[PDB]
Amino acid sequence: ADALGMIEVRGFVGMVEAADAMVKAAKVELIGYEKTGGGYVTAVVRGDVAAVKAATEAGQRAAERVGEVVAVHVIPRPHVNVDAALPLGRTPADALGMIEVRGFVGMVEAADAMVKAAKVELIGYEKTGGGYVTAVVRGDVAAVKAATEAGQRAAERVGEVVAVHVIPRPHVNVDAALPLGRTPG
Amino acid sequence: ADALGMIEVRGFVGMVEAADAMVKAAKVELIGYEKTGGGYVTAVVRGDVAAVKAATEAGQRAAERVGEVVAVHVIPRPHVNVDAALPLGRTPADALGMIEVRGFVGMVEAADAMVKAAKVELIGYEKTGGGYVTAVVRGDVAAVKAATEAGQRAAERVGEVVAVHVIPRPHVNVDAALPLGRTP
Amino acid sequence: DALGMIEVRGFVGMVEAADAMVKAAKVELIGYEKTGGGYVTAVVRGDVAAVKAATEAGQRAAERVGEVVAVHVIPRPHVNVDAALPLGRTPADALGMIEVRGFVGMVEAADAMVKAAKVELIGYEKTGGGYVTAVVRGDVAAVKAATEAGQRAAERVGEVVAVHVIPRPHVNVDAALPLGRTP
Amino acid sequence: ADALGMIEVRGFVGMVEAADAMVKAAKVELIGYEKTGGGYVTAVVRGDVAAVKAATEAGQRAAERVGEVVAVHVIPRPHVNVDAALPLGRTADALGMIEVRGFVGMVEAADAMVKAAKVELIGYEKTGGGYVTAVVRGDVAAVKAATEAGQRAAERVGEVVAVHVIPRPHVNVDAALPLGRTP
Amino acid sequence: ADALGMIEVRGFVGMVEAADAMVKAAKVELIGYEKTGGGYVTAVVRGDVAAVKAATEAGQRAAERVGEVVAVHVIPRPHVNVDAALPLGRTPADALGMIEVRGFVGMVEAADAMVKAAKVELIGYEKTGGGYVTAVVRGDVAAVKAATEAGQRAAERVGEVVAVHVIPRPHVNVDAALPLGRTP
Secondary structure (H helix, E strand, O other), X not given: OOEEEEEEEEOHHHHHHHHHHHHHHOOOEEEEEEEEEOOEEEEEEEEOHHHHHHHHHHHHHHHXXXXXXXXXXXXOOOOHHHHHHOOOOOOOOOEEEEEEEEOHHHHHHHHHHHHHHXXXXXXXXXXXXXXXXXXXXXXXXXXXXXHHHHHHHHHHOOOEEEEEEEEOOOOHHHHHHOOOOOOOO | OOEEEEEEEOOHHHHHHHHHHHHHHOOOEEEEEXXXXXXXXXXXXXXXXXXXXXXXXXXXXXXXXXXXXXXXEEEOOOOHHHHHHOOOOOOOOOEEEEEEEEOHHHHHHHHHHHHHHOOOEEEEEEEEEOOEEEEEEEEOHHHHHHHHHHHHHHHOOOOOEEEEEEEOOOOHHHHHHOOOOOOO | OEEEEEEEEOHHHHHHHHHHHHHHOOOEEEEEEEEEOOEEEEEEEEOHHHHHHHHHHHHHHHOOOOOEEEEEEEOOOOHHHHHHOOXXXXXXXXXXXXXXXXXXXXXXXXXXXXXXXXXXXXXXXXXXXXEEEEEEEEOHHHHHHHHHHHHHHHHOOOOEEEEEEEOOOOHHHHHHOOOOOOO | OOEEEEEEEEOHHHHHHHHHHHHHHOOEEEEXXXXXXXXXXXXXXXXXXXXXXXXXXXXHHHHOOOOOEEEEEEEOOOOHHXXXXXXXXXXXXXXXXXXXXXXXXXXXXXXXXXXXXXXXXXXXXXXXXXXXXXXXXXXXXXXXXXXXXXXXXXXXXXXXXXXXXXXXXXXXXXXXXXXXXXX | OOEEEEEEEEOHHHHHHHHHHHHHHOOOEEEEEEEEEOOEEEEEEEEOHHHHHHHHHHHHHHHOOOOEEEEEXXXXXXXXXXXXXXXXXXXXXXXXXXXXXXXXXXXXXXXXXXXXXXXXXXXXXEEEEOOEEEEEEEEOHHHXXXXXXXXXXXXXXXXXXXXXXXXXXOOHHHHHHOOOOOOO
């Protein structure tokens, strides 16, 4: 049985940055993310007990710079009954810009100001519940930086901005399990 | 030509951690490292203006956690005379465990405690200058994580420990440009 | 392409700003705009990353000589902006400069420069509001001693604004700016 | 046996200026330099007791204007055992130098020098202890303004140690020091 | 595997005195010395766990008289991986006078005054980095004593004197592992 690592963040942006820091620290597989509602989302990774332990710590320190970290824990050897009843994966590049706003109106204005500021592509939006919505844009590292900065400013005068972050080079394992507009397929 | 990125740290451990965080943060190429003596080393990355500047900000925050950073700067378009006269690369995986001590005695005791803790391989030692030496060990993440914690506790009772860090999966560009015992 | 602008109330501060931009990154100086009253604006264009790195590099060098008014970068300008505004996208000898808010003080400045060493007075630039700039060219040794002697002789006459010397101006500066070395 | 004169400086720039002022003062031969590490370098000259004593005093007065002068001593008649066990030599274009205790500060200084004027960066010298020195050559005027611009850009990066320019270095300096003009 | 004994001293004079006291106290072998730069040098001896411990304490006791004793440690049973990657000696008489100066100019004046004071022979000089240089002379204990005391008084007028020591009868093992002009 592979190890289990989880990071829960009240915010879709903080969970993505946490997932990006975990797959870059050690060799762990990002099986996906669990949405419990009310903005709470949980990134789930699996691998070796030491690789998960190191990635769990590295992801928490990187996620504290963007969003609210709720719980962070590592299970060395999860029971077989846990993997059977819970969606934990083992049940038998382009730059990234993100803006999370507690309000659908504030997220639309943030996305409208991003595609007009620089050469970026709005791949869509993510609903984490509780009124939290996240605009996801992809493009060049110089473009999404100038886009999110212009989008965050234009959105602070409309709604309640939760988190704004830019990932210059997201890992290949992140774009495979997370809906970030670059899923190969 | 390409852009230029440099991070100088008075410590071989803080430079490797900075170089590892840069090649992972953006699309940059680590051409190598420069030793100016007295414990000073400088990691040199190159790429485009946007990626080098975005990788340099990530390498600084990761280096300040371990080593004593000295200088952090980016040059957008270096002159042709600079690339020709300076070694900047444009002249026409196992786990990583490192312990740095300003003293040869403290480094040997730390290296002896690392190989005795778990199954790790002592690839050798790096002499930074000015009494600075760094013991480098490789192996699996389970053994390297426990070897350094046993080596640091046994090295502080001997000499002056500078920095102790562990990299679970170092980037392929790091093992290719730095003498970390895994160069093909 | 991106857009970069630096506005300085002084023709000398704009040339040093434009010279520092094309040397720092890979951008093209499309020209300059004179809005009158001594206000001039250097306009460069390129990619989003290079324009940002060059705009601040030119601002840091322009603050040493002249009064910087505004500095801004537009990442992706709308196509209607480039069609109605002169922003470039529309469908070497040394440099010695002395700017004076007075025509009398500028003539004495230019007279003392050509007498100190062997330089060529290519002409003068009128930026409006009483601001005039004397431009001399030559080797680095001459324009260094010419401007220093011309600065001391001009302060005793008029209101000196700025004095600066660029040893090797970039090839893009002499192409877009009237500095007597246009191919 | 010949006489002996030495000047030790914690700075490669201060040692070169000390060596230049010595061979220009009296009839002495610069036999080379010794690097002891940690930024300490020593200039060694040989000649007659009259020439080595006037050059040593003339090199100390000029070396104090740039870097830290560690020791200065003259030996009139060294023992034969000293010349047998110690490397004491017994058995032009302008010069611009910028020394920084940090490799990053030296690169930014070297980049700003070749961008400011038409000077050639011949390379860099590593004296140990983190001390590195960028060496550029050219004419007396451009290398003067290049080092001034390279020093201004390096202060906002690292620790600048010494900055100096030599108009016409002696032929004995270029023959014993790796300054890019060695025959 | 033989025992490991190391004594690190920021000064070449203190390292030679510590090495001379180790081979005379117990039955150990001096494999050599390690130079890490910045004036730091490490004397490495090897023998049994008891002889190394007794000689190491005797070396530190004599090294505290001249120079900075940085680190002192004894590894009883060193791992075979340490001896493979580190130069620790296990891999597959006339009087002595020394004057250490943090300055090349003061070291030359000290060496010149020594050979002129008494009948001694200047064998050479050792560079330990960081500006530290050590002049070494050999001869009779009467002449070496009179030479070092005259060279120190002349060297203090020039540079920074670090340490001055005289060994009347250095052990034969010291002259074989250290560059002191009397190597067979």
